[PDB]
Amino acid sequence: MSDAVSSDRNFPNSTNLPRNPSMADYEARIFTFGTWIYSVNKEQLARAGFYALGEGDKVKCFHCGGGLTDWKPSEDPWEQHAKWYPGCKYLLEQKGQEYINNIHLTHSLEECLVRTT
């Protein structure tokens, strides 16, 4: 009888809120990165599974590990992390192992644009 302790009922105690993305996720993550920028909105980068450690740029992956630093102009987090170390929970779960595997094998994205501009 695996009772576990996660999915049962709401209101854990009082402080533990449901989630509130635009309160402790979007602004929280970004707040750790800073107004500074490089490619896309730091929030997008964080959504994939990234979080700054106070210092600008220096950001590490969640759970899967692997610290990323010195990003490259115009780059997505999904493909980036997936290549360096494809082992994220939400990432793999999102588009399944099939999608993650596809990335780590051949070039993807940046296609179907009339005629490469």
Ligand X SMILES: CN[C@@H](C)C(=O)N[C@H](C(=O)N1CCC[C@H]1C(=O)N[C@@H]1CCCc2ccccc21)C(C)(C)C
Q: Nearest to residue 88, comparing CAs of 100, 76, 104, 98?
A: 100
Residue closer to ligand X, measured from CB, 38 or 99:
38
Answer whether 57's CB lies under 8 Å from 45's CB.
no
Q: Is 45 in the site for Zn ion (CB under 5 A)?
A: no
Q: Is 58 in the site for ligand X (CB under 6 A)?
A: yes
Q: Which of residues 56-115 bind Zn ion (CB under 5 A)?
A: 61, 64, 81, 88
Instruction: Print the binding letters for residues 65-84 with ligand X: x by CB under 6 A, - otherwise.
Output: --xxxxxx------------
State how far the Cα of 23 lies from the Cα of 48, in Å rounded to an integer: 17
Backbone angles phi, psi at 52, to 5 degrees: -75, 150
Binding site listing: 61, 64, 81, 88
Binding site for ligand X (CB under 6 A): 58, 60, 67-72
